[PDB]
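From the pipeline queue, job 12 of 40. The input is one protein chain; the requested action is below.

Action: predict structure.
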Amino acid sequence: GSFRDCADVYQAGFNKSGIYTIYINNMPEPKKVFCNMDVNGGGWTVIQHREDGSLDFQRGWKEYKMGFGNPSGEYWLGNEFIFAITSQRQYMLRIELMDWEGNRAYSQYDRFHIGNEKQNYRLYLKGHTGTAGKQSSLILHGADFSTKDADNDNCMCKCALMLTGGWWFDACGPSNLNGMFYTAGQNHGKLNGIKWHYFKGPSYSLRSTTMMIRPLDF
């Protein structure tokens, strides 16, 4: 009952990566999450994981709000949970990426939060670093969340319909880790794939993604 996130779990002396139950006031109910305790001192709450395309990401606003998938595998925490957590104090966002050639890279943001649902879960990002490009593949400067059934993007076009999934699409911007999963034999020349432009470019679909958050002050 006292664990608000994976940083609480780690700080209590649990150092093993795996599935934990967290809860914070303002969340609607408890949430099972994967805690990554391995990367740069641990205490990471996973908000997104992909590795095999078993879980479809072509989902509407409501499913992107409440979360989908199972934390033993591929999942999306849900914007309402991301909002509830990142509301409470300053979180940092880390993004683990692997291509199909065995190269691991990461993007990290010192400050991450999102707006509430009436602010379309708008993305706020500051302080990008990492090995996944000098420039941020996520727009830092103000993109709403969009889905196939909610076009909130910065485009006259419908980025979610063109690229698939739910993302902070710009017009349509240099990322979508919630695009279509392509296998090693299909990973090239895909505009609607799992993409991080400043790592592997705009046409390359990545092998695995983990988006994870912890307190800036951890």
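Job complete. Residues 79-86 form the longest helix (8 residues).
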